[PDB]
Amino acid sequence: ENKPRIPVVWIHGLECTCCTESFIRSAHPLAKDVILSLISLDYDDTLMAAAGTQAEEVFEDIITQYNGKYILAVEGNPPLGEQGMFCISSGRPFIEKLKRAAAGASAIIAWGTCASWGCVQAARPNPTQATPIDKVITDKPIIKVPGCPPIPDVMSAIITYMVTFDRLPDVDRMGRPLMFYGQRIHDKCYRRAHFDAGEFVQSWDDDAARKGYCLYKMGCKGPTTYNACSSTRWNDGVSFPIQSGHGCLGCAENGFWDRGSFYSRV
Amino acid sequence: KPRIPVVWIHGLECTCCTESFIRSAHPLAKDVILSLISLDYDDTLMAAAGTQAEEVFEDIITQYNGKYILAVEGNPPLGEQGMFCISSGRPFIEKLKRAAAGASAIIAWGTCASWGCVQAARPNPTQATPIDKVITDKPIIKVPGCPPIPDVMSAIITYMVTFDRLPDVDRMGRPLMFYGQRIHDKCYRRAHFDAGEFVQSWDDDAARKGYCLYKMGCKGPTTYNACSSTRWNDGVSFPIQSGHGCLGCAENGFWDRGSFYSRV
Amino acid sequence: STQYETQGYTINNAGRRLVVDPITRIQGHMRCEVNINDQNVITNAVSCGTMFRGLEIILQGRDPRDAWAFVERICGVCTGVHALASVYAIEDAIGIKVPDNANIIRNIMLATLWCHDHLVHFYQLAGMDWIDVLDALKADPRKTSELAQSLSSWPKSSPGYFFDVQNRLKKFVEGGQLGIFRNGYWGHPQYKLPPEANLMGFAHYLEALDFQREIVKIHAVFGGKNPHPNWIVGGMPCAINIDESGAVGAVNMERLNLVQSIITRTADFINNVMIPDALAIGQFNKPWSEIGTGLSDKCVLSYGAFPDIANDFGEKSLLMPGGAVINGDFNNVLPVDLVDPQQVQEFVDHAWYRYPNDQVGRHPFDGITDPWYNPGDVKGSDTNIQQLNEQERYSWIKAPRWRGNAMEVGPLARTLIAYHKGDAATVESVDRMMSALNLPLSGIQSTLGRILCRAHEAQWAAGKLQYFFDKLMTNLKNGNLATASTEKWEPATWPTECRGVGFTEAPRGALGHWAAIRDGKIDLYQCVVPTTWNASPRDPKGQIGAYEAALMNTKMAIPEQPLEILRTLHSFDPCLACSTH
Amino acid sequence: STQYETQGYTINNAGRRLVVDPITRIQGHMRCEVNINDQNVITNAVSCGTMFRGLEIILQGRDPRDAWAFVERICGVCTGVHALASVYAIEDAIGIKVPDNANIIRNIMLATLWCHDHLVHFYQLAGMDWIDVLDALKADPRKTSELAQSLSSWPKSSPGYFFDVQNRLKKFVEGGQLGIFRNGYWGHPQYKLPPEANLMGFAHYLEALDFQREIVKIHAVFGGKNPHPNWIVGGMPCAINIDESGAVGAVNMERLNLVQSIITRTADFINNVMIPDALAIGQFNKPWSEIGTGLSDKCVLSYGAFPDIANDFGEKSLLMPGGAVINGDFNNVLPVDLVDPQQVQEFVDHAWYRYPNDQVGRHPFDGITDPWYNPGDVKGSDTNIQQLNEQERYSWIKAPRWRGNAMEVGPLARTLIAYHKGDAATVESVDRMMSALNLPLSGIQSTLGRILCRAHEAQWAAGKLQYFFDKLMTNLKNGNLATASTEKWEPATWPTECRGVGFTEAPRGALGHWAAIRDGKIDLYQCVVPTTWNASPRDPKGQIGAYEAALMNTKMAIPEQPLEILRTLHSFDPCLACSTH
Numbered sequence A: 001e002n003k004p005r006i007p008v009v010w011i012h013g014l015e016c017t018c019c020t021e022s023f024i025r026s027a028h029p030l031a032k033d034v035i036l037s038l039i040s041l042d043y044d045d046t047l048m049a050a051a052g053t054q055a056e057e058v059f060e061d062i063i064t065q066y067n068g069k070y071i072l073a074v075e076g077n078p079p080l081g082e083q084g085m086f087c088i089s090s091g092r093p094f095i096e097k098l099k100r101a102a103a104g105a106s107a108i109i110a111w112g113t114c115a116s117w118g119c120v121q122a123a124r125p126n127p128t129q130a131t132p133i134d135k136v137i138t139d140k141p142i143i144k145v146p147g148c149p150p151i152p153d154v155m156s157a158i159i160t161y162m163v164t165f166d167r168l169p170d171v172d173r174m175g176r177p178l179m180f181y182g183q184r185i186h187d188k189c190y191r192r193a194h195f196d197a198g199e200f201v202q203s204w205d206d207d208a209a210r211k212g213y214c215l216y217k218m219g220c221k222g223p224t225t226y227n228a229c230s231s232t233r234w235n236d237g238v239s240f241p242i243q244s245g246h247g248c249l250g251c252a253e254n255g256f257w258d259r260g261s262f263y264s265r266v
Numbered sequence B: 001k002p003r004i005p006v007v008w009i010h011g012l013e014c015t016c017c018t019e020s021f022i023r024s025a026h027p028l029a030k031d032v033i034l035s036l037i038s039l040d041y042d043d044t045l046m047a048a049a050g051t052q053a054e055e056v057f058e059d060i061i062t063q064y065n066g067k068y069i070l071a072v073e074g075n076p077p078l079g080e081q082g083m084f085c086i087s088s089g090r091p092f093i094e095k096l097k098r099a100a101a102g103a104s105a106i107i108a109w110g111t112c113a114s115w116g117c118v119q120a121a122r123p124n125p126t127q128a129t130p131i132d133k134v135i136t137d138k139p140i141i142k143v144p145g146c147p148p149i150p151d152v153m154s155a156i157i158t159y160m161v162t163f164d165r166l167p168d169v170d171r172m173g174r175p176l177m178f179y180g181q182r183i184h185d186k187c188y189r190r191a192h193f194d195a196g197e198f199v200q201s202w203d204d205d206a207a208r209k210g211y212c213l214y215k216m217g218c219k220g221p222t223t224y225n226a227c228s229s230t231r232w233n234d235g236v237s238f239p240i241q242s243g244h245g246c247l248g249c250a251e252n253g254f255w256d257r258g259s260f261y262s263r264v
Numbered sequence C, D: 001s002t003q004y005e006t007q008g009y010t011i012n013n014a015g016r017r018l019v020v021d022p023i024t025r026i027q028g029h030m031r032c033e034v035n036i037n038d039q040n041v042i043t044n045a046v047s048c049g050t051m052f053r054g055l056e057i058i059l060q061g062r063d064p065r066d067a068w069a070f071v072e073r074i075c076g077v078c079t080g081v082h083a084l085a086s087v088y089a090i091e092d093a094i095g096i097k098v099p100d101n102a103n104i105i106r107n108i109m110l111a112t113l114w115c116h117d118h119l120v121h122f123y124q125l126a127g128m129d130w131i132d133v134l135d136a137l138k139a140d141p142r143k144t145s146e147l148a149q150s151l152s153s154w155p156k157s158s159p160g161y162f163f164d165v166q167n168r169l170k171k172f173v174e175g176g177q178l179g180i181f182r183n184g185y186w187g188h189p190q191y192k193l194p195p196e197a198n199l200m201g202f203a204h205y206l207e208a209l210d211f212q213r214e215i216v217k218i219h220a221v222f223g224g225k226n227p228h229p230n231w232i233v234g235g236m237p238c239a240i241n242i243d244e245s246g247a248v249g250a251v252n253m254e255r256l257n258l259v260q261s262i263i264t265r266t267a268d269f270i271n272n273v274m275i276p277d278a279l280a281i282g283q284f285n286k287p288w289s290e291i292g293t294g295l296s297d298k299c300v301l302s303y304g305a306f307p308d309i310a311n312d313f314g315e316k317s318l319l320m321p322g323g324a325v326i327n328g329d330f331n332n333v334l335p336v337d338l339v340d341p342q343q344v345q346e347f348v349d350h351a352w353y354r355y356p357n358d359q360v361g362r363h364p365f366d367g368i369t370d371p372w373y374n375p376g377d378v379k380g381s382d383t384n385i386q387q388l389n390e391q392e393r394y395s396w397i398k399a400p401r402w403r404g405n406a407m408e409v410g411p412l413a414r415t416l417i418a419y420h421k422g423d424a425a426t427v428e429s430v431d432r433m434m435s436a437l438n439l440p441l442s443g444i445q446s447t448l449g450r451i452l453c454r455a456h457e458a459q460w461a462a463g464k465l466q467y468f469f470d471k472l473m474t475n476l477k478n479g480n481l482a483t484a485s486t487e488k489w490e491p492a493t494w495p496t497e498c499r500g501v502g503f504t505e506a507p508r509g510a511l512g513h514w515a516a517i518r519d520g521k522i523d524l525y526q527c528v529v530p531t532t533w534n535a536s537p538r539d540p541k542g543q544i545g546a547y548e549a550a551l552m553n554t555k556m557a558i559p560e561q562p563l564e565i566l567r568t569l570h571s572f573d574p575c576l577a578c579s580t581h
C-alpha cells in the first residue's frame, strides 16, 4: 500500500538559514529519512527543484489541495517596515505569503529564535520592524522551537513526535515543547559542581579554563536559558557551547541579544 | 615505519576490557591495530593457537626484549599454586612474570589488573591479586574501570604513540588526563544534588525529570573517572544519564564498599 | 591406554596425544587434548576449563538487589545476559512483576546482545578458520567485486574498494609485523575458498570490526554503557519521559530515535553482509556439514527466552522456544522444568571440586562450589601439565546433565528444538538455507550447521529488535510509561526465606541462575551456564559432553596444525569465563 | 525600449521580459528578471536582492567583543566566516595578537566550512540543475554500477545498491507526493546525462545529504555547535589540556582523535564522490564551458585567506592568495589594499539606500547604511513589483567596485588569481583537470568552470585540514598549548578611538568587515560580502555585476522553464542574506 505522508510547507522570511541547516544535521532520523519516509516536504525554497512561477505553482497547488491538513513550518520573520518590502517574495511582501500559508495550516512550527521571538534582526534598533510569527498569526496553534538555531536532533525529535503520536507536543506558557525546553541549561550543566564550589574561569585560557571550570564569571547565560544543550548536546552529542569553553549566550530566550553584553554576568 | 610492539595477556578476567577497546570510536580499533601499534600477541584475536601461539609469544618477547609494551587484562590467582588460571599447562603468573620482565612499560587495563575487581571481592576464593603486587620493578599505568571507557583506552594509546611518552599519573598510577577528577565533579545532575532534588524510588516523578541519584546509592562522589564528561560508546550515555547511580567501578575495592544502593 | 563405549562413540586414548593450550579466539582459558589413530582421526577428546574465579562463593551474603552487577562480570562478551538472568531470579524468588516496558526493554537488551555477539563471533573469532587471510593478497579485485555483487546487494563492493583493502593488507604485512596473522594456518589444505572469496571475507571482517561498536549503542541508551550495562530488580533504571518537563533527564523521543537508527543499520549489516558470507562458507565447505555432529543428532536443550507476555515464562509467551530432545527422539520434544531436582544436575567426579558424594549429581538449589585442584596422575607435574588425566579430575568446569543425559546447547540446539516444535519462522529459515546448499536437514547437525544457525539467529534477533521497539512505542502512544516496579524494593517487603530461578537463552545457549534468599541476603547462588554444558567434562557413567563428542571421529590433515579442532571448537563460540564463573 | 553598451555587452531591454521570483536552491531571497530577443537569447539581466535586515545598524553601540556573535548571524550557511572576519577586524583595530594554536584552530574552522559548504552546494543546491532525478528511474542498475566503478574507487557502487536507491525513488514518485521534485525541469533538453549517470548522481546526492552532517563535528569540538559556533576576540575559547588533571574539561586527546577521524572521512568523501561527479558533469556538459563567462575573463578579485603565520596577513603568510585582475590582464595580478579609499567602494544609485551623493562610491570606513525602499514605477505598486525598474533603484544589495571596476569573486576568481600568480598546486590541478576534459584553459571561465573550481577547492580545503591539524599537534607535542591572548581583553586597555579591517575568503568569495571603535563601543561596522559583489546592481556608469554579466548572451530553450538561468546563478552559490546583511 503506498501510503501518503503529512504535508509540510516550509517558508522563509527574514532569516540566515541556520534553522534549515540545523535540520539537515539531524543524526536520527537522518533528514533524508524524514523527507523520504516521515513527512511530505512539499515546499521549501532552499531545497526544491522548481523556481519562480514553477515554485509559485507548487505553493498554490499544495495549500489548495491540502487546505486544513498541512503543517506550516516557518523560518525567519516578517518585517513591518517599508510596507513589508524589506522581505519580498514573488514581488509582494513576505507577510502576504505568511498569511496565505497560515490560513490553510492545521498547525504552525516556529523554528528558531527568529520565528519565535525576533532574533538578531529584531535586536536594537530593529531597523526593519522584524516581528515574530505569533504577533502576526493569532488564530493558529504555534509551537515555538527557539534557539539560534535549535539543536538538530531536537528539531527532528519534535517532528518525529508529531508524526508518531499524531499530536502537538505539550508546551509551556510560551508555546515551547516541555520535553526540551522545560529545564534550564544550568539545571543540567556538567560544570555545576564548579559553580556550586565557586570555581570559575576568570580570564580566557587560565588554569581554571583548562580544567573546565564554570563560565558564570565569563558571562554564561545558562542560569536564565531554557534549552536542551547541556543534556542532548549538539551535532550527534559531540559538544555544546559551554563544553567547548564559551558561556551560553542565551540564544533560546526572547531578547537575548539586548540583555547586555555576552561577557557580563547574569 | 615499524609500529611499536604490544603483547596483550589475559589472567583471570571477563574480557570486558578487550571488548571495551574494540568499541573505540576514534581512532577505530581497526586503525589502532593496522596503523598505530603492532598487536603481536592477543589470545582473543590471534590466528595461531597452542604451540603456534606459544611460538609467537616466545619470538616476540625475545626479539623485542626491552622494547614492547605489555598490556595486562585480568589478574593472577595465588591460590592452588596458581593453578586457578592455567596457560600452557603452567600457572598464569609465570607467563605474567616472563612477559613483564621484557616489557618497557605495562598497562594494567581495568579494575581487574589495577586492583582485583570482582574475583577479588570477599572472600576472594582464588587469592586474585592485582598486577602491581606481583610485578614491582616496572612502570605500571593503571587504567581502571569495569571496564574503562573505550575512547579513554584508545586516547591513552594514541597519547603514548603520538607523544612517545607515558601519560602523567596520580599517586596511584592513573592517568591524570582522565582520572584527575571525580564523576560528581562533572556530573550534569549536580544542579539537582545542590538543590536537594533526588530520586527516592525508581521511576518516580523525580526519576522522570533526571534528578540526582545520590539517595539511590550513586558512588559518583568518591569515584575518579571520565564518564560524566567523555561519556560511553561514542558519547551516547553513561550510567547516571541512563538512570542508575555510579557503582564506583573505577575505584579499588568498590564491590566491598557496601551495597550499591546504600548512600555514599 | 583404555577404550570404552559411550553415546555411540568408542573413546580410545591409544595413539598420538595432541595438546592445544592455549586455545585462542575464544573467551577465557581452555585446554584441549586429543588422541588420534593411524588414520589421523580423533578417537578421544578432552575439554578442560583452565580458569576459575568463584562468583557463586562471592555472591553469598550480598544484597539480592546487588547480585546482577556482580554476576554480570561473569562475562564481558555475553555482557548483560547474567544480569538479566539475575534480575529474573531475584524477581522469581521475591515475587516481583515488572511493568511491560521494562520487559520489552530487557528483550531489546537481549536481542541487541545476540546481534552483537553473533556478528563478532562470525568474523573476529571463527572467521580466520574459514578465510585464508594471506591468500587474499593473491585475489583479483575485479573478480572479488563480481563475486560480492553476485552474493549480495550490499553497497560496498567496488573493485577499487577491494584493491584498497588488499593494499592495506599488503602494507600491513610487508614490514614483517604480521600481528594477529603471525604463525597462522594459512595454506592448510582445509582452506577451500578461492582468493577472491578470501579478500571479500577479509574486507567484511574489517567492516564488522568497525560496525559492531554501533550495535551496542542500544545498550548505552537503556543501560548506560557497554560493556556491562546497568539493570535493576523490578525492571530497568532508564525512566521514560516523552512529553513532560525534564524529558532531557530521561529516555525521550531523541533517545528512542537513536535506538531506531541503530536497529535499522544492524538489520541491514547482518542481512546483507553476515548472512551471504555464512551461506558462501557453506557453499565452499559442504563436507563440514558431515563433521562435528557430536551430540546434535542425539541430545539438545533449550530453556527458551524472550517472554513476550510480561512476567510470563511459559510456552505461550517465550518467543524463542524451550524444550529438550534425547536419544535422537526429535518427534517428542520434552518440556523442561528448572525446579525439578531430577532434571538439571551437575556432577564433579571429573572436575576440580568436592562433593559429599561425587557419584551423584546435584540440582543447583542443592549446589556446592568447593574448589579442589587435584589433577591426579598427570603426565608432567601438577604445576606443568603435559597431559591431563581424563580418567581422573581434569577441569574447572562442572558437568551438567539433564535427566542424566549429556546435552548440546546453543544456536544449533535452539534451532533444532524450534524446528521440531513447528515454529514457522524457524522451519522456513532452515528449509531455505539447506535448500540453497542442496543439503539434507541433517547437514545442520554439524560444525558447519552451528555457524549457519548462528547467522540465522543474528537475522532473527535483528528482526525481533524492531518488533520489540514497535511494542515499546505502542505502549508510549497509549500513555503506558512505567519502567520499574518498586513495591518490593525494600527488604522488609520480602519473604524471610525464598528461592527462585532466572533463565534465558544466552548467545551460547541455555542459562540459569538459582538463588536462595534468607533474612534479606543471598544464602545460595548457583549458576549453570551454556559453555558449562557444552565444554563439560565426563560424568560417573563416562558420558562425554558436547565439545568432546563433536571432536570425536574428526580427520586431521596435519596433526601439528590443529585447524580442524579449532574449527569445531570455535563453532560453539566457547566462553570459558562463563563456563567456570 | 533602451539599449546601451558596457563591458563588451549590449544591454537591451526590448523584447519579452521574464521574471524568476523566488529564486530557489539559494540562501535567502532573490528576484531575477531578464529580457530575451526573438531567438530566446538574454539581452538584459537584472539581479535583485529581495531582503534586508540591517546588521550594520544593529551593531552600533555594541561591545566590540560581542560583535562576532551578531555578525555570525548574517548567515547560517557560510556559518562562522563572519565571526572570523569580525574577530580579525576587532583584533586589527585594538592591536591584539593571538597565539599560534588559536590561529591554527581558526584556519581549521574555515577549512571545515569550505569543505561543508562546497559539498552541500554541489549536491543539494546546484545538483538538480545537472542531474535529471526523474530520468534516474530509467537507468539500468548494472550499467550504473559499471559507470560509477569506471570513475571512482568509492566503495558504494553495487548494482543492488543502485537498484535499492532507484526503487525507493520509484515508490516515492508512485505515491504522488513529489515533494522537492514537484514541478521541476525534468526532461528539459539541456539535461544531457544518460540515465545511469543520473542514478549515480542521485545516489550521491543522498549520500552527501547524510555525510555533510559529520563534517561539522569539527566545529562542534572547537566551537561548541554548528550552525553558529563560538569564538573570542583574542583567540578561541576552547582551552586545551592533554596531560593534566581536568583534561576532561578541555580539548584533550579524545577530542583531537574525534577531529582527526572527521578529517580523514571528509577528504575521502570529497576525493572519491564529489570530485569524480564534478568531472562527470564536465564530461557530459562540455558546451557549458562556453556559457556564463560573465566577468570571469575580465575582472576577478581575491583578498586572500588562511594566514599560516599567526597574526601576519601578508602575501608570505596567506595560503590562499589575494590579488586583482582587471581588463582581462591576467599577466599582471594587482595588489589589493582594504584601507585604500580608492580601492573598495560601494555605490547605491541602483540600490534601496540613501547617500549624500549617489553618484559616487564610498569606502566602507565612510560607509552609510540608510535604507530607502524606493522602487519607482514597477508596473504595479510599491507592494506589487511586476517589473523592476533597472534604470533606477532595484535591489537591497549595494554595488561594490574595485578601483571602479566590476569584479567577480569566489572559487573561479580565486583559482584564476592563484593560477596566474604561479601557485604550483593550482597550476597542476587546473591543467590536469582541463586536460582530462580535453578543454582549453579558457573553458574554466564559464558556468561549468565555477562548478569545477568549487570541487577543486573542496579537495584543497580537505588537504589543508590535515595540514592544520598536524600543525596543532606539533605545537602540543612541544608543550605550546595557548589558545587565547587576554592582555587587551578589558576595554580600559583599548585605544579610545581605533579602526580595523578583518578579511578572508568565504566559500563564495572575498569578505571584509570594517570596524571603528570609540569609547569602548562600535561606532561603525560595515560589511562587504562576496555575494554583495557578485549579485551587485549597476553603478553610475551603468556597469553590470557578475551575475548580470554571466546571464548576458545566454540561449534559453524554453523561456518559461528557466533552467539555463538557474544553472548560471546557482554556479556562483548565491547567498542573499550575506549579500544584504
Ligand code: SF4
Pocket: A185, A186, A187, A189, A190, A191, A192, A193, A195, A213, A214, A215, A216, A220, A221, A222, A223, A242, A247, A248
Ligand atoms: S557554565 Fe553556565 S550553565 Fe554551566 S554551571 Fe556555570 S553558569 Fe551554569
Ligand code: SF4
Pocket: B183, B184, B185, B187, B188, B189, B190, B191, B193, B211, B212, B213, B214, B218, B219, B220, B221, B240, B245, B246
Ligand atoms: S547523580 Fe551521582 S555523580 Fe551526579 S550529582 Fe548526583 S550523586 Fe553526584
Ligand code: SF3
Pocket: A015, A016, A017, A018, A019, A020, A075, A076, A111, A112, A113, A114, A115, A119, A120, A147, A148, A149, A150, D073, D076
Ligand atoms: Fe535560525 S534563521 Fe538564523 S538568525 Fe537566529 S534563529 Fe534566525
Ligand code: SF3
Pocket: B013, B014, B015, B016, B017, B018, B073, B074, B109, B110, B111, B112, B113, B117, B118, B145, B146, B147, B148, C073, C076
Ligand atoms: Fe575488564 S576484565 Fe571484566 S571484570 Fe572488572 S575489569 Fe575485569
Ligand code: F3S
Pocket: A147, A148, A185, A225, A226, A227, A229, A230, A240, A241, A242, A247, A248, A249, A250, A251, A252, D225
Ligand atoms: S547559546 Fe544557545 S545553543 Fe544552547 S548553550 Fe546557550 S541555548
Ligand code: F3S
Pocket: B145, B146, B183, B223, B224, B225, B227, B228, B238, B239, B240, B245, B246, B247, B248, B249, B250, C225
Ligand atoms: S560505575 Fe563505572 S562506568 Fe563510570 S559512572 Fe561509575 S565509574
Ligand SMILES: [Cl-]
Pocket: A113, A117, A118, A119, A120, A122, A253, A254, A255, A256, A257
Ligand atoms: Cl529575540
Ligand SMILES: [Cl-]
Pocket: B111, B115, B116, B117, B118, B120, B251, B252, B253, B254, B255
Ligand atoms: Cl577492586
Ligand SMILES: [Li+]
Pocket: D091, D092, D095, D096, D097, D311
Ligand atoms: Li593583527
Ligand SMILES: [Li+]
Pocket: A057, D183
Ligand atoms: Li507544471
Ligand SMILES: [Mg+2]
Pocket: C056, C398, C526, C527, C528, C529, C581
Ligand atoms: Mg556453577
Ligand SMILES: [Mg+2]
Pocket: D056, D398, D526, D527, D528, D529, D581
Ligand atoms: Mg554592507
